Amino acid sequence: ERHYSTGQDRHDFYRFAARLHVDAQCFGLSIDDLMDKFSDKHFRAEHPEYRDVYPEECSAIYMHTAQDYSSHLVRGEIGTPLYREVNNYLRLQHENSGREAEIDNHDEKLSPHIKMLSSALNRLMDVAAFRGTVYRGIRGDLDTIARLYHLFDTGGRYVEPAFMSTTRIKDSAQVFEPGTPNNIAFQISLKRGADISGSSQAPSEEEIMLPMMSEFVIEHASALSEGKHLFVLSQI
């Protein structure tokens, strides 16, 4: 059970996305604008990994990496950004295993996107899986820090129910050099992940994205400057 989109799914997604609000205070792209840039005959010519990836899938990746869409409106502006509502939903959800065996048992509102994004990553990992080292920067509590050292100390897996987002570029995690904002760094070596830089709103961020329910062994855990901590992760 790895999920791949169907024709009906791709219609669902279009209608789902068509209802999203775009941030007017920016140069926003609607689903039609996206369906267009991602169906553009030159796109798959410049990015052949996308040869057998649908525009609806490119759009799902794009919309997830962006800060401009929300399901809701708050007075003037867009509500909470799509990726956050979705990620948060996946982390809180207590009705599924959270795995791809059960992607058709999620909330009717968000599932068209959850499914589309999953399919996108699957299509891409199929042709061009990424293996290697990527990085994550987090900002957190002593409580958060303590949990990780705890997981490490007791051999518990680090498990992320949502779509993990990571970067190939150490600098981009914004953790390692003082005096950057993030105080928790993750150095992750992946056996398998999705290079979505082609569809990302910010390709220069050079991101690799993981499917729902990615699982890691914490190999090492140590201090850095400050204040700062480094956990070395290994994908299962």
The CATH code of the domain that includes 98 is: 3.90.176.10
The closest alpha carbon to 64, from 170, 205, 236, belongs to 205
User: Considering its fold, how many domains does the chain have in total?
Assistant: 1
Q: Return the exposure string of 2-26: e unless at least 16 CB atoms fall within 10 Å of the residue's CB, then b.
A: ebebeeebbebbbebbeebbbeeee
Which residues form the domain of 107?
1-236
Q: Which amino acid is at 53?
A: V
Give me the numbers of helices (H) and strands (E) for the chain, helices first please: 7, 11
